[PDB]
Ligand binder design. Structure first.
Ligand SMILES: OC[C@H]1O[C@H](O[C@H]2[C@H](O)[C@@H](O)[C@@H](O)O[C@@H]2CO)[C@H](O)[C@@H](O)[C@@H]1O
Ligand SMILES: OC[C@H]1O[C@H](O[C@H]2[C@H](O)[C@@H](O)[C@@H](O)O[C@@H]2CO)[C@H](O)[C@@H](O)[C@@H]1O
Ligand SMILES: [Ca+2]
Ligand SMILES: [Ca+2]
Ligand SMILES: [Ca+2]
Ligand SMILES: [Ca+2]
Ligand SMILES: [Ca+2]
Length: 1052
């Protein structure tokens, strides 16, 4: 059993020792064995200086651009320097360079008291100072990276151990493994022997299936090794170390503890007998439950009891702990810092919290005191049982502050709060009530779980409605900025921003300049920054301390369903955490079970950030359980009707489906949907994407109709924003001065739009732009198959969302100069019509009915009340209120300045006009079951299109929905068929397709008179129908005594 040791055999000696009044410094340069000629260390030099601290240097270098401090000499182990000294006592500061750069990113202090010989050595890319070149040398053979994966009880996967004679797994309980003084590894260890990856491991971690496999003895005490640091080391026959790296243990943790741990319940569980606390921490050395008083003083610290089979820790107490604050005191090794950390953490299964989430709190959500009157009997206003039920879903995506921050008719104390929804007299609530009466069925809420990016301590926050003096007191960045002069003015921040507007331009973006500072300490953020997954956000409650927020959240939910008549969908963000590591305030999960809840890079062990932040690992069993347990609470205790999964594509398809199975047992009608783009995680598992979820019943946002109607894509910048016109903005038919879009390209977008109005089904058959018969999957969408769904209920169509530019801002970027204000309002309505009158589920951004603008801001997550403003007093749409954030839209300033003032800014006249158009569309959507068939096969048997092929009139979309004898049963007793005609063009168009068929304009549109989207439409005696420019008409075939012939789908 050779004793692994650092390469001490061929270690460098000492080029030279220091004499009198001189300090020698070595730069050990690992020269390859083939070193045939002394490398050129001519460009090598140091930077000397003797400030207040160290002043032993004798006439140090002055300029930083002085590279004459070249080496005094060199050998086969690097160059060395002989620094003159005035005193052989004290220290000196140096910076090893290779020219102008810093060979070492750090200042070095050569303490003579630490090195009496005053002869040190340094390593390239090292921060420590060694006493000899031999030490620095062996130092370059220490532990690096973490490409070793302990995936199961007896399997280790590690590249660096391939072919190496000696492969072992060393471990230390309380210390960091490393060669001792001598230079040999004397720590305890277990011998590994080459093996082949089994079928089980290959299936669990496909992306590691080709890694060199190593086997561990069956009698190894895994539990003990997982208590401290573990390191994989490789060495030759002589026992010399070739490489040593850290080990990722998520895999073995699941294989050892997951099944037993999955069978238990977690959090502070208050029941009859009392309370039982349980937290999963399989690697912790110790765990104590710390109880705090209301004033946050420690009342007691109880060591918990560890269950060997599960790795969970528990503690049982009396029911008198109800309402108590607590945290878990951890003693655990964290691989990132390579140290046994000691810290207090909140409960990841927390169901209540103190202000700003500093302490978790024991709570019983079933408590009547935490429920509004009549809560238990709260019913779901809209059905979600059958596919036809689901298809009627019409979503209004909203944000707590966007809704009431600016409404003066909402009581001041409730602005930006959950309770604003209960102010029935306010403009905002009355507006939502009317939208509901008109056909909007669901309210989707941006992050209302506990987010981390807003300080819940009110005295640390300042909003634009408050004095500029308050902003200066809570924000030091402002106090040291160019706006500091406003600190002692008597103006509010909003008043200052308003006066800055006149002189604001691309050359002086002063509005966003000030707002960027305001954003750091205000109450605003979308909230895609998870702190705790199963506790409501505290800043949206009137009182963030304790359980109060729970009852207030429920009061809001009740108000929406009972008083507004709409179902509620919650946006969830399980794909990432706000932070990881052993030090960040918001790192919870990664502090309790380090390296388990986060997805890590296979080689470095660093937490990935593809999501934006700290990527989570839903593929790990206990996080999948946390997610499902969390969704169960929101479903049962908060009565949420559906969930929108943020970046669902980063979750395994199997995990999302398993979670749905679990929740359906609680609420059989719950609906799941989310972003199913490409997460690039396919190498690790089958992702929950648009393609993979086909036929599962899980919905996904469709980017097909979205891009075809809006024009362009979410990554466009500069002139591309104007060049890429959409069907909704006149592609081909009303070109602007920059576009080069051909008629063919415009018709391809129309193919995508028609396919989307039919549910974006993979098997739907249509006639494309060239007159060819094509299935939905055959219509191209940037190289990918267009149609991907099995049922229209698996598709969520939309033309505006919180992400990216608003619909109005896109139309402003793309509309031709000659399209006047009135025309642009109709373009917004025409664009929304493709969604509202389509078979897919309808989704829209709060405010599209008010021509909402963000002053061109593309990503407004932290742009505050100013750029996210929605005026329910209907004075304007927030357009032209200053150039957007330069950090993300600066490259768009030129194009913005060019298109911004083309027409006037919408006023009350235009806003009222748009709301009417909007409610007309939603009212039409629900006026007949034909608009929402739900089932794919039924859509294929009843839906067809006219005005298709090479001889089509560009921009005119004509869809027919059959209810005649050839379709089967009559689903609508008032009609034998319906015709949807959208004329997205500046010309009047005449349809001869239904001559002599007795077609009639919908009663709903007739009733709107000249305020209808169909104003001016004429149904002639000869049966022909003429539509004016930018109009929408819904026509119907009145049903007689029996089922008529209807509008049979044409054979293709
Ligand atoms: O604060 C994190 C992150 O939030 C936003 O990004 C979200 C986006 O809004 C969601 O629709 C989805 O794409 O997930 C993203 C990450 O959670 C902001 O857009 C982004 O700037 C910010 O960093
Ligand atoms: O937060 C991620 C990212 O999501 C969206 O981008 C999608 C895009 O919408 C899809 O059409 C397709 O290209 O995949 C993209 C993600 O890879 C948002 O549009 C974007 O703003 C956001 O950053
Ligand atoms: Ca020395
Ligand atoms: Ca919070
Ligand atoms: Ca903010
Ligand atoms: Ca990867
Ligand atoms: Ca009928």
């Amino acid at each position: 059993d050779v004793v692994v040791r650092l390469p001490d055999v061929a270690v460098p000696g000492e080029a030279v020792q220091a004499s009198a009044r001189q300090a020698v410094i070595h730069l050990v340069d690992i020269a390859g064995i083939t070193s045939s000629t002394p490398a050129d260390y001519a460009t090598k030099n140091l930077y000397l200086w003797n400030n207040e601290t160290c002043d032993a240097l004798s006439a140090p270098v002055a300029d930083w651009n002085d590279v004459s401090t070249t080496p005094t000499g060199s050998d086969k182990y690097g160059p060395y320097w002989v620094i003159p000294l005035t005193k052989e006592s004290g220290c000196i500061n140096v910076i090893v360079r290779d020219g102008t750069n810093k060979l070492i990113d750090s200042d070095l202090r050569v303490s003579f008291s630490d090195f009496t010989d005053r002869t040190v050595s340094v390593i390239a890319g090292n921060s420590a100072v060694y006493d000899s070149r031999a030490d620095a040398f062996r130092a370059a053979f220490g532990v690096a990276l973490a490409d070793a994966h302990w995936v199961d009880k007896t399997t280790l996967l590690w590249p660096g151990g391939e072919n190496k004679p000696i492969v072992r797994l060393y471990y230390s309980h309380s210390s960091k493994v490393a060669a001792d003084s001598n230079g040999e590894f004397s720590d305890k260890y277990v011998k590994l022997t080459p093996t082949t990856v089994n079928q089980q491991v290959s299936m669990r971690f496909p992306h590691l299936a080709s890694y060199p496999a190593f086997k561990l003895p069956d009698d190894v005490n895994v539990d003990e090794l997982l208590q401290g640091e573990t390191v994989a080391i490789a060495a030759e026959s002589d026992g010399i170390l070739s490489s040593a790296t850290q080990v990722q243990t998520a895999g073995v943790l699941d294989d050892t503890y997951a099944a037993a741990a999955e069978a238990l319940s977690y959090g502070a569980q208050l029941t009859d007998s009392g309370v039982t606390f349980r937290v999963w921490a399989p690697t912790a050395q110790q765990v104590e439950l710390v109880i705090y008083s209301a004033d946050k003083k420690v009342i007691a610290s109880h060591p918990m009891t560890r269950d060997s089979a599960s790795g969970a820790w528990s503690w049982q107490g009396g029911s008198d702990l109800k309402g108590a604050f607590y945290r878990y005191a951890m003693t655990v090794y964290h691989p990132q810092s390579r140290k046994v950390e000691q810290y207090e953490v909140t409960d990841p299964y927390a169901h209540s919290l103190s202000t700003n989430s500093e302490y978790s709190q024991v709570v019983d959500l079933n408590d009547s005191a935490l429920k509004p009157e009549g809560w238990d009997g709260l019913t779901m206003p809209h059905a979600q049982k059958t596919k036809a039920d689901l298809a009627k879903m019409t979503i209004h995506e909203s944000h707590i502050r966007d809704l009431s921050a600016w409404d003066q008719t909402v009581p001041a104390e409730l602005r930006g709060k959950y309770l604003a929804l209960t102010a029935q007299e306010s403009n905002m609530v009355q507006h939502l009530k009317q939208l509901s009466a008109s056909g909007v069925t669901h309210i989707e809420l941006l992050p209302v779980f506990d987010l981390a990016t807003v300080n819940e301590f009110s005295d640390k926050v300042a909003d634009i409605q408050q004095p500029f003096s308050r902003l200066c007191e809570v924000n030091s960045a402002v106090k040291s900025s160019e706006f500091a002069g406003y600190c002692d003015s008597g103006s509010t921040v909003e008043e200052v921003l308003t006066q800055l507007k006149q002189n604001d331009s691309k050359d002086n973006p002063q509005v966003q300049a000030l707002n960027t500072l305001v954003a750091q300490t205000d109450s605003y953020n979308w909230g895609y920054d998870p702190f705790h997954y199963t506790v409501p956000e505290g800043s949206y409650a009137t009182d963030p301390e304790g359980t109060a927020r729970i009852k207030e959240f429920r009061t809001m939910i009740q108000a929406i369903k009972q008083d507004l008549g709409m179902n509620v969908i919650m946006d969830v963000v399980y794909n990432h955490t706000n932070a990881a590591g052993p030090t960040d305030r918001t790192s919870v999960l990664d502090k309790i079970v380090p390296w388990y809840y986060q997805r890590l890079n296979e080689t470095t062990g660093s937490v990935e950030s593809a999501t934006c932040c700290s990527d989570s690992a839903p593929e790990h069993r206990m996080f999948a359980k946390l997610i499902a347990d969390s969704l169960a609470v929101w479903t049962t205790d908060y009565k949420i009707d559906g969930f929108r999964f943020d970046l669902m594509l980063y979750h395994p398809k199997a995990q999302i489906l398993s979670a749905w199975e679990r929740i359906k047992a609680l609420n059989p009608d719950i609906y799941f949907f989310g972003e199913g783009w490409d997460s690039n995680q396919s190498d690790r598992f089958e992702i929950a994407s648009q393609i993979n979820l086909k036929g599962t019943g899980i919905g996904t946002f469709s980017d097909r109709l979205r891009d075809a109607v809006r024009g362009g894509g979410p990554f466009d910048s500069g002139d591309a924003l104007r060049q890429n016109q959409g069907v909704g903005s006149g592609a081909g038919v009303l070109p602007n001065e920059l576009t080069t879009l051909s008629d063919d390209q415009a018709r391809h977008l129309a193919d995508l739009t028609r396919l989307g109005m039919a549910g974006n089904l993979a098997d739907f058959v249509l006639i494309d732009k060239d007159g060819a018969v094509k299935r939905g999957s055959e219509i191209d969408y940037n190289g990918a198959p267009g149609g991907y769904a099995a049922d229209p209920t698996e598709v969520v169509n939309y033309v505006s969302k919180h992400d990216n530019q608003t619909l109005w801002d896109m139309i402003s970027y793309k509309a031709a100069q000659e399209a006047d204000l009135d025309t642009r309002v109709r373009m917004q309505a025409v664009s929304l019509a493709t969604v509202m009158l389509g078979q897919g589920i309808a989704f829209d951004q709060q405010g599209s009915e008010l021509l909402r603008s963000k002053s061109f801001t593309r990503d407004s997550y932290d742009s505050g009340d100013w750029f996210n403003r929605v005026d329910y007093s209907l004075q304007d749409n927030n357009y032209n209120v200053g150039m957007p954030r330069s950090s993300d839209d600066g490259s768009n300033y030129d194009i913005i300045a060019r298109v911004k003032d083309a027409v006037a800014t919408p006023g009350e006249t235009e806003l009222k006009q748009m709301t009417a158009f909007y409610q007309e569309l939603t009212a039409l959507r629900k006026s007949s079951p034909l608009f929402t068939l739900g089932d794919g096969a039924t859509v294929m048997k009843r839906v067809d299109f006219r005005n298709t092929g090479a001889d089509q009139q560009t921009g005119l979309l004509v869809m027919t929905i059959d209810d005649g004898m050839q379709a089967g049963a009559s689903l609508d007793s008032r009609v034998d068929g319906i015709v949807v005609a959208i004329n997205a063009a500046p010309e009047s168009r005449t349809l001869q397709d239904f001559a002599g068929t007795s077609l009639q304009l919908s009663a709903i549109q007739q009733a709107a008179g000249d305020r209808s989207l169909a104003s001016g439409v004429q149904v002639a005696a000869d049966g022909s129908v003429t539509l004016p420019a930018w109009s929408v008409a819904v026509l119907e075939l009145p049903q007689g005594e029996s089922q008529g012939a209807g509008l049979p789908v044409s054979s293709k």
